[PDB]
Structures are given as C-alpha cells and as structure tokens.
Amino acid sequence: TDKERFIASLMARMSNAEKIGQLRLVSVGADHPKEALMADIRAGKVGAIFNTVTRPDIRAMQDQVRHSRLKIPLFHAYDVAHGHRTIFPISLGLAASWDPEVVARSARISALEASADGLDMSFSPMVDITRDARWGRVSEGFGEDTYLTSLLSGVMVRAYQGSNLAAPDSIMAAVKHFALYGAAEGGRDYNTVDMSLPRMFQDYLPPYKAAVDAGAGAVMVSLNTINGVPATANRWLLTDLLRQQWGFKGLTISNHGAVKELIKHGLAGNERDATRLAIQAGVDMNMNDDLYSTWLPKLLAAGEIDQADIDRACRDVLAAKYDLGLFADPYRRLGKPDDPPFDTNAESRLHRQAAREVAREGLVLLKNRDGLLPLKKQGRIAVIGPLAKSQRDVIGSWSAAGVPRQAVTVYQGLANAVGERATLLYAKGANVSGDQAILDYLNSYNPEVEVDPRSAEAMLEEALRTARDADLVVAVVGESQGMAHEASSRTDLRIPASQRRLLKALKATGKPLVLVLMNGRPLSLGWEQENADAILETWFSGTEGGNAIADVLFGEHNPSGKLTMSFPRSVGQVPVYYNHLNTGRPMDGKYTSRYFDEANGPLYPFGYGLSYTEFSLSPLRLSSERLARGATLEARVTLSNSGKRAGATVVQLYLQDPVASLSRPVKELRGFRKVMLEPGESREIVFRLGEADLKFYDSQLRHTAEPGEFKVFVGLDSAQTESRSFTLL
Amino acid sequence: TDKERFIASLMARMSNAEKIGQLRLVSVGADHPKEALMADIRAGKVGAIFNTVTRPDIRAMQDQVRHSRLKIPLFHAYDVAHGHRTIFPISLGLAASWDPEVVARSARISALEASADGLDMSFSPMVDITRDARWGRVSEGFGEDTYLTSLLSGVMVRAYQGSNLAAPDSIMAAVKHFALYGAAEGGRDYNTVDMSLPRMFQDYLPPYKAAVDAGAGAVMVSLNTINGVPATANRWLLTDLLRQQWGFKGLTISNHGAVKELIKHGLAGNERDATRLAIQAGVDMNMNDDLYSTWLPKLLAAGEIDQADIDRACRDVLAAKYDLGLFADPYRRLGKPDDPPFDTNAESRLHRQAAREVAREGLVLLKNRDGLLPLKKQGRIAVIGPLAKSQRDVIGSWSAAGVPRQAVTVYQGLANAVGERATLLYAKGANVSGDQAILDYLNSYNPEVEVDPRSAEAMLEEALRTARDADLVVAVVGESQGMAHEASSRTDLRIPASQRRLLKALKATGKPLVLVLMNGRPLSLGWEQENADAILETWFSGTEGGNAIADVLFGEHNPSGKLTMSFPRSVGQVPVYYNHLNTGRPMDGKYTSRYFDEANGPLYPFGYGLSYTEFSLSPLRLSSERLARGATLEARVTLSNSGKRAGATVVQLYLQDPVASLSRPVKELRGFRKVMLEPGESREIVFRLGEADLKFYDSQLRHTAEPGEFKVFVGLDSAQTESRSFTLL
Ligand SMILES: OC[C@H]1O[C@@H](O[C@@H]2[C@@H](O)[C@H](O[C@@H]3[C@@H](O)[C@H](O)O[C@H](CO)[C@H]3O)O[C@H](CO)[C@H]2O)[C@H](O)[C@@H](O)[C@@H]1O
Ligand SMILES: OC[C@H]1O[C@@H](O[C@@H]2[C@@H](O)[C@H](O)O[C@H](CO)[C@H]2O)[C@H](O)[C@@H](O)[C@@H]1O
Ligand SMILES: [Mg+2]
Ligand SMILES: [Mg+2]
C-alpha cells in the first residue's frame, strides 16, 4: 500500500511521453552518442542504462536526472555473469562444485563489486538447460540437469538480491534467457526451438520458475522462436505462464534488438507492428533499438494499443526503481559526494582469496593413471601449449569488467607454486588453431588470440626439445574463450587439430603427459582418455585460475569437482544426456538404439569425477517399503574415505518411475550431498523423499505422482549406482 | 452395406477365441515352427502371415483354412519396399526422379510380381519425413520435403491398390511408420521423438494422411515415443487423429514385438497391461509376440477391456480380407489347381526393362568439371573400388525377394556398354571398411561384404599401377547397403576411411577421376567436391543399376535426377534442411545463426542436380498482383534448352509467407514440373496456386490462409531462384 501510494501518485503526474521514456533501456555507443544520451536523460526520455560500469560515469548520468521535470532516477545494468572485476570460473565450472554455498559466494562477491561501482542490476543468472555441446553459450549455464540448474538458479538470485533490494551491496537479478534458448536446433545460436509442452514444463521451464519464486526482480526475454512464436512476441509465455500462472510481479526486458528482429522472424512486416506485438505479449522494457519511443504514441492514438499496455510496462519500471531504493536515494550505490576518487581497477578492490577458493572446487579430475597426480614440487616440468600463458582465456567468455593483466595464467600459477624447488621450461608448442579462417573469426573484433608467426613444424620441434629436457609434460590445451562465446557454435567437439598434432608428438617422446584442459563446453576426448597419463578439466577458472589449478596439481586441494554435462564421444552422438528415455530397445546387440561406427554412451557421464583418494558407499536402505500420501521416506547410505588423503566427493540420489502414463527417464537427479572426509572417516547420509519428488507432467500437463513402484539410486556418478524400490500408495 | 451385412453376420457367428485368432499376424521361424503354425491355422488361431513369399508355400498355408469351423482365409504380407524380385532404386533414389509416373511404375511392377507369387499386402510405402542423415532408414523414404513425400505417398498407394483391391494384380498398402519415426533424437533408431503439435501437423503427418485419403487399406504403427507416449499405446494418434479426425476405416498393424516393448518404454509393468494399452489405443493386429492370444480373454473376463475392443479389431481384419476378395475366392492370387508349376526365380518373370528405365531417372550428377562426362566408348578405363563388382550392394537394403546374382554391377554395366570399343582395367583398391569392428557388424548374420584378404597397402599399390595404365579412373565407392539399414545409425557421414585413403592416392596420380557413389543416405563430400573431376550419385540403383549407371556415364541418358534431401557439409551441421525458419539473425558476419569452424549451408541443396546440357529460365510472371479468396493464380516461366544435348530438368515452385502469426519457412515446395527438351527447344510452364497451397497450422492448429503478401520462387533448385509477390485479399 505504501509503495502503491508513491507509485500511483507518480504515474498520475506523468504524460505518455514520460511513461514511454521509462521503457527505454540504452547504452553509450554509435547508436546513442554520450552527449545526445545526456540530453535525452535531461528531457525524461531514458529509463535505464546498460554497459556504463564506473562510479564517475554512472554519477555523471545520474546527475542529468535533476534537469528532468519529474527527476525519475535511472537504474544501471551490466552482464555480471561469473564475476564483475574479480572473475570466478564460468558457470559450467561453478556448477561442477556441486555446492550451492560456493556458487552463492561467487554471486555475493559479484554483486558487492558491481554495486561498489554503482550498478543496480545484472543480466544474470543464465539458467538455460543445455543438452547440445555444439552451442557456444553452454559455458554460461550450469549444464544439462533440471534439478541442479533449478537449485543454483534460486541460489544466484537470493545471493545477488540479499534480504533487501535497496541495500547498497545488493543488485537486482534479471534471469535469462526466458525461454528455451539452449535447445536451438543444430546447436546454432538464435536458431529455432521446437518441443512438446510436457518436455518444456518437465525439463526446461523449472529454472526460470525457481528464479521467479526466489524473488527475481527482472526477466530477460530470449531471441528464439518457441514452437514457431518468438519469445519477444509470445503472449502465451510472457503473460499466461509468467504473470497469470507463476505470478511474476517484476520487470520484463527484451534482448538487444529483439523487438525489431520480429520482422526477420516473419511475425511482422514493419517496426510499428513489431512494437505492437512485443508490448501486448508483455515486454515492458526495450533494449537499444528504440521502437517503443518511435511507435507507441502512434499505436495508442490509432487505438492499436490500450493505455493499460503503456501503464503496465511503466509501473514495472517504477516498481523496480522503488525496490532498488533509487527514489529514497538515487546515489545510494555511488557513495557520498566528497568521498575521495579511486582507481576503479585498484588491486585493493579485488577479492582474490574468494576467487581462488571457488576456482579449486570446480576442477574435475577425469583421468590419473598410476597416481601421477598429485605432482611433487621438484625436478624439471615442461609447460607446453597455446593456453599455458593465456590471461585472456583463463577469465573465459562474459568476463564483465575483468582485466586480463590481473589474471593468473596456468604457467604463472605453476611458477608461484614451485619457486626455486623446481624448474619450469616453456614452449607454446602450437597456436590455438592452425586453420586461418578460424583465427580470422577469433581475431575479427579484438586481438583475443596471440598468433605466433613461426611455422607449425618449428613450434613442434621446439616443444619436443623442451619435453626431452624435462621429467614430465604439463600440456595446457583446449579452446580459446572466443570458441565458446555467443554465435560461436561448433561442428567439431575435439581439441583443435593444431593442438592434437602437438599432443601426439608429445606422446611419442615417452614423457609422462598431464593435460590441463581449458574449454567452455564438453569436448570429445577419446584419444586423450586412451593416451594421456592424467587429465584435469579446468573450464575457464577465472582471475585466480592458475593458482587454483597449481593447488590441485600439487595436491594442496584434492580434486572434488564432478561434471554437470555429459561428455560425448563425438559430435555425431549429439545430443547425449543422462536423463534420456529407455526406448523400446535399449542398448545394454544389433537391433537396439545405437550407432554402429563408434562405442556408445558418453565418454564421461553426468556426475563423473575422480579424487586422489578412494570413497566407498554402504548398501542403500529405505526407511520403509511403502509410502502413504502426505508421508516422507528416508534414503540412508554410509560414505567412507577408504584411502590415504582427505577429500570431498558428491553422493548423488537418482529416481526412476518405471511404469507411468508417459515414458519417464531411466533416471533423474533428485538430491545430492557434497561431503569432505578425513582418511578412515564415515558420514551417514540421509535423503528425504516425498510425493513432491515423484511428480511429472502428463500429456495434458497434469502435475501428478501416480501410485506404484519407484526405484531410488545412490552413487558417486550417474552410471556407477545401486537401486532399491518402494511403492507409493 | 453388402460388406457390412456379410461381416456383421460372420462376427455374430464367432466366439471370442475365433475373433482374437484373427488378430494374430505371424511368420514361419524359430518362434513359430512350420507344422505347429499349420495346426494353428487349422484350429482358426491365425489371421494373417508375413514373410511367406512363393505360390506353393502360400497355397499350402491357405489349404489349412478348410479345417477351421468358419474357413476364414488368411492374407499374406511382405516388405515390398522398392521391388519384389526385380529390384528398383531405393525410395530416396526413386524420389530423385521428381516424376510421380516413374515412382508409380516401380510400385505397379512390385505389386504385379508380389501378387504373381500370391502376396496380398506390402508393408509399404514408408513415408516418414527425414531431416537427420545419421538415421539408417533414410534410404527407405523420399527425403526431407512434406509436399513431395505427401504426393509420392498417395502415388505409391494408388499404384499398389489399383481401382480394385480384389483384382489379382492389386496388393494392399500398409503405410508406415505411423508416426514421426524419422525424427528420432540423435538419428539413433527407435529413439525418442519430441515435437510441437504445429510442426507435427505442418511437416510430419501430411504423408500418412495422403496415404489414408488415397484409400490405403492398412497402417503400420511405429516403435517410437511421440511426446512421451509410444505410438503402440497412443490413443490420441491411433483413435482421435487416425479414426475420428481422418476417418481411417482400415486395419492397424503393430510393428514386430511392439506391444511387449511397452514394458521397456515404462508404460506397462507386465505383458497383460501392455496388451490392454495396445488394444484400447487402437492396435488391431499384433505382429509375432502373441500377447493378444495370451491375454485378451483374461482382460475381457476381468472387465479391463470391453467386447467392443475385440469386435473393432476383428472387424478391421475381416473388412481387409473382404476388400482383398479373399471371401469371394481365397485362391484369386494363387492360380488354379490345374496350373503348371514354375521356377519362382525364372529370368522370364523379371522386368529388367522397367528397372533399367526407372534406375536412369534417379541418378544425380553432382559435379562434372570441364565436360569430362559423358565418357567416350574408347581408350583405357580404370574401374576401381570395393563397390565396382558388388551385386549385394547395388540392390540396397530392404531388397525383398531380390536375388543378388541376377543384379548388374557397375563393372558389368560398364563392360556391357563398351564391348570391344574400350578396355576396362579392374582393381578393388580397398575394402568397403578398414575398421574390423565395422566389418564384424556388417558380416554378423550373413556374408554381406567380400573382405579381400590382401593388405590395404597391397590393394592401393595395385590400384595405383592400374590408374597409371589408364586414360581415366572410374572409382566406385561409398557405403555397403548394411550401413544404411534398420539400427545402422552413423556418427560419421563421410565415405569410409579405407576408401578415402584410396581416393587420395588416386587423386595424386593426376588422372581424371569420376566418382560413382553408392549410398543410402546423404554423405559428407567436401573433399570429393574439391578434388574429383566428376561425381555421380547412384544411391543403390537396383537389379539393373549397373546398366542404368553406364547409360548415364556414356551419355545414352542425360542425367536428370535432383536431390530430395540436403547434403550436409559434416555430421556436426545436423540437421540441415531447405525449409528452415529465418531466425531473428539470418546469415547473409559473426552475430548470426551459423558455425564458425566450417562453411555454412548444405554442400548440395534440396532440388540440386546437374545436366550434360544447359537450361535457362525467363523471368517469372504472376497472372495477377492480388488474389481473391476462392480464386486461382497462375505462375508462368519459359524453360529453354540452350545447350547441345537433349535432356530433362525439374522446374521447382517455392512459396514464402513472410508475415504470419507463426514464423513460417524461408521457402516451402508447392509444385514442380519435369520437362524433357531437345536442343534449342522451349516450353512455357504454368503453375496453378490456390488458397489450399497457402494455409498453415497456427499455435492452436487453426488451418487457415491469412491475408497478406506471398513470395513465389521458381528455379532449377532450392538455392538458385528468382521471386515475385502477390497479395491474398
Ligand atoms: O516386415 C516386418 C517389419 O519388420 C520390422 O523390423 C523387424 C525388427 O523390428 C526385428 O527386431 C527383433 C525383435 O522385434 C524381436 O522380438 O527380437 C529380436 C532380437 O532377439 C529382434 O531382432 O527384426 C526383424 C528381422 O527379421 C525386422 O524385420 C521393420 O521395422 C518394419 O519396417 C517391417 O515392416
Ligand atoms: O548485454 C545485453 C545482452 O546482450 C546480448 O549480446 C549482444 C548481441 O545480442 C548484440 O547484437 O551484439 C552485442 C555485441 O556488441 C552483444 O552484446 C546477449 O545475448 C545477452 O545475454 C546480454 O544480456
Ligand atoms: Mg509409476
Ligand atoms: Mg502472411
């Protein structure tokens, strides 16, 4: 009522010109030069800013608000995806921690730094489910699993927003991309999404819903068609589902140029009609293309739009500014005037300890033949590969205000660890790619890839001479961050050919070979799994990446990360995911659902990851054989560290509904516990399962649990499990 | 009414035991030994037989019917997919004729031979739309296009059934696989199908509907889930759509073991429940697993199914036998007792002339650098490759009663063409595969691949010496038919590595290189398109394949075939198809829908194919710029043969609806004309477009044409076109 009073009196004052100006979301660019933008803010024609990210710059913009009749403050947004200035691992690496508190910590520090620079909103978290490793943006999400992505979706929102959206160290979450953006056909960015409603409700929508139920202040709408209707023009998605069914009360934001793109989708013949479709579907705020400002007045005057369409959009912008505390104090995130100036990028405003501890948790040990890892800080260590000394790659895609020169490379991380106790020998070995067309693509906007002008053969000969002079080879190989970016979809999932040629030459020297992988998507690693002695998955591990990688390689931290996305044997197996249907003819002979020209199944399954120690699970026990409606059941198992080193693992609870009105998955994740144990230590793990855990969407979207058998599986990954059954009454 | 009266009086006489026995469809095998099967027919416990394919054998079975109380005759079925004894090109090759009359001719001759052997029914045509080249069964269909597959669906049914199903030279069509079988996830056979209802009705269902509207007597139900519900248990598909909405009056047949497989799908806990789900969904007839015989009496007595369920299934079997003339005369397709015996496989019962003329029409010329084709009947011709002398491969998969020793190989076809006027030099060059696991798979049941015991290197050095002694190299390469079979899904679309190694060695000799491809799916041909001088796509061209291939290679027939399925550049681009959506960011730079690591688009588009002559199109003319509802529009263009040889091409009419309430394809096929022209000859081509051509299914399945612009394209393929607009009023 108090908020409603302030907001209703303010909107009673406003002209349509002022209401429509609140819907304009812009950035300083060629589209909107700084001084023209300043004039537009003075004239009341701007609602919010993105990509202006420092206190002085945001202050100068907020200072123009004084010259408007109503003095409605701006909010300031940015893409703080996995860090603002202190860069954490990419989301796919954070997910691999299997630890909500580690992810929450990355989010809280991101919000602290962003809010310290004056930012009120992040276009995050990205909660799109990804089953297609070809898509460039899988790096930005939490992998293939609905339960895990849904849990981390809520965690990110609560950690960004705190208990109070007005707090100077809180930012608003704009959850993206609503919806289904990750299921693009062919894994080609922006491409067609087509799926049944039961799959959509069961597998793809719950993460957006968790963000809404966690109190997300905003929702960013996606660029893709859903079943033939672009999200930006999809009333069924933005009004019926998001508002009426889920009760979302916040702000909807279109993606960059999305209203105008309704023309190229063939939903609209002109910008006037595109604008009508977007506002009536339920898009409040319009990013960069300015069609709302250009066309809403004419649409309203012609009776094509209703006043209520303008009023609803405007109300959502004002309610967001109110909740962010910006009517109370527009400078609340910008300090007091006469606070002394600072270097935005000062070393003292970073959080290196938080970045290092988080980065350690996401590293996944994929292979370790004969205890080669951990390494001893001694002897001669060859560090070879195009990513060994790469500052720009270790902070990954969507590195926000991250500064490459402030990042710790793998080489530098190893140098910091050994000091004088061991000798590092360096050789680039190869360029990230040997294909000139792929280098032209990676270098097309900014210099992202250091191209060594020497021949491939000369770099190899140097690498082989370096390996020969060492006790063992740490090969730092994989993708540059520009390969797992928006619009950077891949037809091949292997390590690039220039680097595989290097690895083959390194193998033939007979030296022990440790692979340190940098990559923003699942890679095809058949040759590496056969021929490398050890493999460490490091994703893009952030500002402190190299230090956290050295901490695991030398045994300071025992690798605890587990995969949250299945690793295909090749691109021709796509899609592969752990929660698939059985079919009528599952492969364990010939007449089964399989390929004939390659081994079947993923190379590494969902939830896979090794340790320097060994863990054991006692038999799974259920607290009863039968479960009454309204009752809870307990699944009990004892986890023991039966090896020589302290270490964490992740105990995973899976569920199967083997008889149902729909064909249900062979298994679905329904719980986990990350557990840190000393040698010989045990922990009794108790999972609680109720009827809520057993429901699914039928063909008419009835969300019900049916009577009958459920199988419960517990294990340290999605493959290596045992099951016990109970009956729901 | 006469039919209704005959069938109602017969079913009034029948016990449930006799009604349920009519639902049993069996074959002689280990599951059902001959003499036990004979006794079951005598006892009235068998409805129909499959895989018994000679007159004496079918007669012996029909002779047992006398011993039953009611003497209800059997029908006899077989998989006559692309020929019975005289084998035509695989369906994907027949589709490439772009000529309904050529396809009708292959179907009519198939029915003539099958009916001459006593068969009443073929499990054909297969009308599944296929956009995923990995799937093993794309060989069995007509490619990726809804309009073309729908047209050929009706053509096949009318050609099999004639105007009279009782005629002794007619067979019943059982259209398959109802439904969506070709959209399996990952292109893995039997795998999950998930799609929106608008896409299902717009793109996938029309071919089954065309079969039903053409009077198909039966429908074979598919093995896949549709949106979580197996087809065999899918009441929405088999009752609501097929019976109530489409008014199908004929027979439904389950696939082999499909009812029992409902347990592995997780729709049923036991065989009793699987049986209930199948009969109540609307499966009439049960192939080989015998659950109907085992369980229907107990299901009925317990009130779990209704008498009406048994009565409806039984009635459909009796109505099928009645329409096939089997109550009037059960021997109508089996001759008289007086008839003299014959050799079923006599050379005089074949139709070589029809198979040769059909096979010529499907061959697609993909590349011809500098007029290398046609070849002259002179000089020295090297014939090299594992498929050059392959009889088993040229007749393709699903070769019914085809005899490989009666087939004409490419080598033999070339020998028959040159006689003494030129010298052929033969060298195998390589085995079909160099991977022992792939050879074990292809050779697992019968010897399908002749494995040359010599080393790869020894075969190469013999091939290179043969090339060096010749004027040019005809390399006969591709897949064995067992690679494009049921359950033979591929993760790689290139020619096998043993053969690519051979092709590379052949390229390095400098000799002119003609590639003759045998394959049952689109192949990835990037290297071949760059390095071969000529490329001829021959699919698997049947019993007279080698003669038809020689007829095109030596210029007797001017290549006229055009692709009906897009050829991907690599497996990592799947799916690619011509009738895709534009997206919001079509590729004409970086922020578009594309891959960065490979050239974009298909290597060869839908409707692509070259000629030994050159054709030109005059500018497209529309009969008016505006079109009243209920009125017809004319699209006119003049085709000229502006080159030196008689030859045919295919003029293709495409439509775009660029503003619609759903995002509509960049292009959809809406007509074509195959035109044969002498040099210097012209023909004015007139296409008729009406309102039915302009409709689409919206989000609520409203099937309407919306007022506004339509773009009309005419060209010789889906890429190289010119467009004009009209407005629907
Ligand atoms: O002509 C009939 C029909 O055949 C179908 O293909 C079948 C396969 O589905 C079948 O697979 C077997 C199982 O159904 C059976 O119960 O078990 C064994 C393993 O023990 C499987 O091999 O195999 C036969 C081969 O004889 C195939 O014909 C086609 O899908 C369909 O198109 C065709 O009309
Ligand atoms: O920061 C706002 C949103 O930006 C989107 O990326 C932009 C492209 O769509 C646009 O066309 O080009 C620029 C490159 O200069 C990109 O910033 C993302 O898709 C969104 O996630 C992001 O929130
Ligand atoms: Mg159940
Ligand atoms: Mg239109």
Short mmCIF file of N, CA, C and O in Angstrom, two decimals, chain B residues 156-214:
data_model
loop_
_atom_site.label_atom_id
_atom_site.label_comp_id
_atom_site.label_asym_id
_atom_site.label_seq_id
_atom_site.Cartn_x
_atom_site.Cartn_y
_atom_site.Cartn_z
N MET B 156 2.14 -44.06 -54.51
CA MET B 156 2.52 -45.46 -54.17
C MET B 156 1.26 -46.26 -53.81
O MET B 156 1.09 -47.41 -54.28
N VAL B 157 0.40 -45.69 -52.97
CA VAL B 157 -0.82 -46.40 -52.52
C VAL B 157 -1.72 -46.69 -53.73
O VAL B 157 -2.20 -47.84 -53.84
N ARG B 158 -1.99 -45.70 -54.56
CA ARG B 158 -2.91 -45.90 -55.71
C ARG B 158 -2.29 -46.92 -56.66
O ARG B 158 -3.02 -47.78 -57.14
N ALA B 159 -0.97 -46.87 -56.89
CA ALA B 159 -0.26 -47.81 -57.80
C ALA B 159 -0.30 -49.24 -57.23
O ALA B 159 -0.56 -50.17 -58.00
N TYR B 160 -0.11 -49.43 -55.93
CA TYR B 160 -0.24 -50.79 -55.34
C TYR B 160 -1.68 -51.31 -55.41
O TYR B 160 -1.88 -52.48 -55.77
N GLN B 161 -2.66 -50.49 -55.07
CA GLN B 161 -4.04 -50.99 -54.82
C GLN B 161 -4.87 -51.00 -56.11
O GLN B 161 -5.88 -51.72 -56.14
N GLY B 162 -4.48 -50.25 -57.14
CA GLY B 162 -5.31 -50.08 -58.35
C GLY B 162 -6.62 -49.43 -57.98
O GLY B 162 -6.72 -48.89 -56.87
N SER B 163 -7.63 -49.49 -58.85
CA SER B 163 -9.00 -49.02 -58.53
C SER B 163 -9.77 -50.13 -57.80
O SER B 163 -10.88 -49.84 -57.31
N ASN B 164 -9.24 -51.35 -57.75
CA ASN B 164 -9.97 -52.51 -57.15
C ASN B 164 -9.01 -53.41 -56.35
O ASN B 164 -8.19 -54.09 -56.96
N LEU B 165 -9.19 -53.46 -55.03
CA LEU B 165 -8.32 -54.24 -54.11
C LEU B 165 -8.54 -55.75 -54.28
O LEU B 165 -7.68 -56.50 -53.80
N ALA B 166 -9.64 -56.18 -54.91
CA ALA B 166 -9.92 -57.61 -55.16
C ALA B 166 -9.17 -58.07 -56.41
O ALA B 166 -8.93 -59.29 -56.56
N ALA B 167 -8.77 -57.16 -57.29
CA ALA B 167 -8.03 -57.56 -58.51
C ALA B 167 -6.83 -58.43 -58.13
O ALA B 167 -6.13 -58.19 -57.15
N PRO B 168 -6.61 -59.53 -58.87
CA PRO B 168 -5.46 -60.41 -58.65
C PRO B 168 -4.06 -59.79 -58.83
O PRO B 168 -3.09 -60.44 -58.44
N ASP B 169 -3.96 -58.61 -59.45
CA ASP B 169 -2.65 -57.93 -59.63
C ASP B 169 -2.56 -56.70 -58.70
O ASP B 169 -1.61 -55.93 -58.85
N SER B 170 -3.52 -56.51 -57.79
CA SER B 170 -3.51 -55.45 -56.75
C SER B 170 -2.99 -56.04 -55.45
O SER B 170 -3.24 -57.25 -55.22
N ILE B 171 -2.28 -55.25 -54.65
CA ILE B 171 -1.97 -55.63 -53.24
C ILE B 171 -2.39 -54.48 -52.34
O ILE B 171 -2.49 -53.34 -52.81
N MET B 172 -2.63 -54.78 -51.08
CA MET B 172 -2.98 -53.74 -50.10
C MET B 172 -1.69 -53.03 -49.67
O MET B 172 -0.64 -53.70 -49.50
N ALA B 173 -1.75 -51.70 -49.57
CA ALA B 173 -0.68 -50.88 -48.98
C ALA B 173 -0.90 -50.83 -47.47
O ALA B 173 -2.02 -50.48 -47.04
N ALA B 174 0.13 -51.18 -46.69
CA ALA B 174 0.19 -50.84 -45.25
C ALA B 174 1.25 -49.75 -45.07
O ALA B 174 2.45 -50.06 -44.89
N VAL B 175 0.80 -48.49 -45.11
CA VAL B 175 1.66 -47.29 -44.98
C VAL B 175 2.32 -47.34 -43.60
O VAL B 175 1.69 -47.74 -42.61
N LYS B 176 3.58 -46.94 -43.56
CA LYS B 176 4.39 -46.97 -42.32
C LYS B 176 5.30 -45.75 -42.32
O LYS B 176 5.39 -45.07 -43.34
N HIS B 177 5.94 -45.42 -41.19
CA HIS B 177 5.66 -45.94 -39.87
C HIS B 177 4.90 -44.86 -39.09
O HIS B 177 5.48 -43.81 -38.82
N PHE B 178 3.63 -45.10 -38.76
CA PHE B 178 2.73 -44.11 -38.14
C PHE B 178 3.07 -44.04 -36.65
O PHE B 178 2.76 -44.98 -35.93
N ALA B 179 3.72 -42.96 -36.17
CA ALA B 179 4.16 -41.79 -36.92
C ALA B 179 5.48 -41.23 -36.36
O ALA B 179 5.84 -41.52 -35.15
N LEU B 180 6.15 -40.42 -37.19
CA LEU B 180 7.23 -39.49 -36.77
C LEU B 180 8.55 -40.25 -36.58
O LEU B 180 9.50 -39.68 -36.02
N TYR B 181 8.61 -41.49 -37.03
CA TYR B 181 9.73 -42.43 -36.77
C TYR B 181 11.06 -41.82 -37.21
O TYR B 181 12.04 -42.02 -36.50
N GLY B 182 11.08 -41.03 -38.28
CA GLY B 182 12.32 -40.45 -38.81
C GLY B 182 12.86 -39.24 -38.04
O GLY B 182 13.95 -38.75 -38.42
N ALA B 183 12.17 -38.72 -37.03
CA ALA B 183 12.68 -37.57 -36.24
C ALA B 183 13.37 -38.04 -34.95
O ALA B 183 13.55 -37.20 -34.06
N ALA B 184 13.75 -39.31 -34.85
CA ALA B 184 14.44 -39.88 -33.66
C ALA B 184 15.60 -38.96 -33.25
O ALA B 184 16.43 -38.56 -34.10
N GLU B 185 15.66 -38.65 -31.96
CA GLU B 185 16.77 -37.87 -31.37
C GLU B 185 18.10 -38.54 -31.69
O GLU B 185 18.23 -39.77 -31.49
N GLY B 186 19.08 -37.73 -32.11
CA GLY B 186 20.44 -38.20 -32.36
C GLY B 186 20.53 -39.05 -33.62
O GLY B 186 21.61 -39.55 -33.90
N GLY B 187 19.43 -39.18 -34.36
CA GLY B 187 19.34 -40.10 -35.50
C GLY B 187 19.57 -41.56 -35.10
O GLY B 187 19.82 -42.38 -35.99
N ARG B 188 19.43 -41.89 -33.83
CA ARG B 188 19.54 -43.27 -33.31
C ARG B 188 18.22 -43.99 -33.55
O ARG B 188 17.19 -43.44 -33.16
N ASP B 189 18.23 -45.17 -34.16
CA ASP B 189 16.96 -45.86 -34.46
C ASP B 189 16.20 -46.09 -33.14
O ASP B 189 16.82 -46.23 -32.09
N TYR B 190 14.87 -46.06 -33.23
CA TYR B 190 13.90 -46.36 -32.13
C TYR B 190 13.90 -45.26 -31.06
O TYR B 190 13.13 -45.41 -30.07
N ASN B 191 14.70 -44.19 -31.23
CA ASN B 191 14.89 -43.20 -30.16
C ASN B 191 13.68 -42.26 -30.09
O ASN B 191 12.91 -42.15 -31.06
N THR B 192 13.55 -41.63 -28.93
CA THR B 192 12.61 -40.55 -28.57
C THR B 192 12.34 -39.57 -29.71
O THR B 192 13.29 -39.05 -30.33
N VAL B 193 11.06 -39.28 -29.92
CA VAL B 193 10.62 -38.18 -30.81
C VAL B 193 9.85 -37.21 -29.95
O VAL B 193 8.92 -37.63 -29.25
N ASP B 194 10.22 -35.95 -30.05
CA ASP B 194 9.59 -34.87 -29.27
C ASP B 194 9.42 -33.68 -30.18
O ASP B 194 10.44 -33.18 -30.70
N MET B 195 8.19 -33.21 -30.34
CA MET B 195 7.94 -32.02 -31.18
C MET B 195 6.62 -31.35 -30.82
O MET B 195 5.76 -31.95 -30.16
N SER B 196 6.51 -30.11 -31.26
CA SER B 196 5.29 -29.29 -31.08
C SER B 196 4.21 -29.82 -32.01
O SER B 196 4.52 -30.46 -33.03
N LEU B 197 2.97 -29.55 -31.66
CA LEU B 197 1.83 -30.02 -32.46
C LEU B 197 1.79 -29.29 -33.79
O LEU B 197 1.57 -29.93 -34.81
N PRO B 198 2.03 -27.96 -33.84
CA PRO B 198 2.07 -27.28 -35.13
C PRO B 198 3.09 -27.88 -36.11
O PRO B 198 2.79 -28.01 -37.28
N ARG B 199 4.28 -28.25 -35.64
CA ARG B 199 5.30 -28.82 -36.55
C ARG B 199 4.84 -30.21 -37.01
O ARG B 199 4.96 -30.54 -38.23
N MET B 200 4.31 -30.99 -36.08
CA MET B 200 3.80 -32.35 -36.33
C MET B 200 2.77 -32.30 -37.46
O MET B 200 2.91 -33.05 -38.42
N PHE B 201 1.77 -31.43 -37.35
CA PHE B 201 0.65 -31.33 -38.33
C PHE B 201 1.13 -30.67 -39.63
O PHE B 201 0.67 -31.06 -40.68
N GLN B 202 2.04 -29.70 -39.54
CA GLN B 202 2.51 -28.94 -40.72
C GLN B 202 3.44 -29.82 -41.57
O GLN B 202 3.28 -29.87 -42.79
N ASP B 203 4.40 -30.48 -40.93
CA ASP B 203 5.55 -31.08 -41.65
C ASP B 203 5.51 -32.61 -41.67
O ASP B 203 5.97 -33.14 -42.65
N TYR B 204 5.01 -33.29 -40.64
CA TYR B 204 5.30 -34.74 -40.42
C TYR B 204 4.09 -35.63 -40.73
O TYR B 204 4.30 -36.72 -41.26
N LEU B 205 2.87 -35.21 -40.37
CA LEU B 205 1.65 -36.04 -40.51
C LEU B 205 1.08 -36.04 -41.93
O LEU B 205 0.47 -37.04 -42.28
N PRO B 206 1.17 -34.97 -42.76
CA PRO B 206 0.52 -34.99 -44.08
C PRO B 206 0.78 -36.22 -44.94
O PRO B 206 -0.11 -36.64 -45.67
N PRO B 207 1.98 -36.84 -44.94
CA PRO B 207 2.20 -38.05 -45.74
C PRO B 207 1.35 -39.28 -45.37
O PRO B 207 0.91 -40.00 -46.27
N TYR B 208 1.15 -39.52 -44.07
CA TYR B 208 0.25 -40.59 -43.59
C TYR B 208 -1.17 -40.24 -44.05
O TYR B 208 -1.90 -41.11 -44.56
N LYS B 209 -1.54 -38.97 -43.97
CA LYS B 209 -2.91 -38.52 -44.33
C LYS B 209 -3.14 -38.74 -45.81
O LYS B 209 -4.22 -39.21 -46.16
N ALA B 210 -2.17 -38.41 -46.66
CA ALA B 210 -2.24 -38.66 -48.12
C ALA B 210 -2.43 -40.16 -48.39
O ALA B 210 -3.20 -40.54 -49.31
N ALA B 211 -1.75 -41.02 -47.64
CA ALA B 211 -1.90 -42.48 -47.83
C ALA B 211 -3.36 -42.85 -47.50
O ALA B 211 -3.96 -43.60 -48.26
N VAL B 212 -3.90 -42.31 -46.41
CA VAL B 212 -5.27 -42.62 -45.92
C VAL B 212 -6.31 -42.13 -46.95
O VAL B 212 -7.25 -42.88 -47.25
N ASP B 213 -6.15 -40.90 -47.45
CA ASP B 213 -7.04 -40.25 -48.45
C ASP B 213 -6.92 -40.96 -49.80
O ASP B 213 -7.89 -40.91 -50.57
N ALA B 214 -5.79 -41.63 -50.10
CA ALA B 214 -5.63 -42.44 -51.33
C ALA B 214 -6.26 -43.84 -51.17
O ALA B 214 -6.20 -44.61 -52.14
#
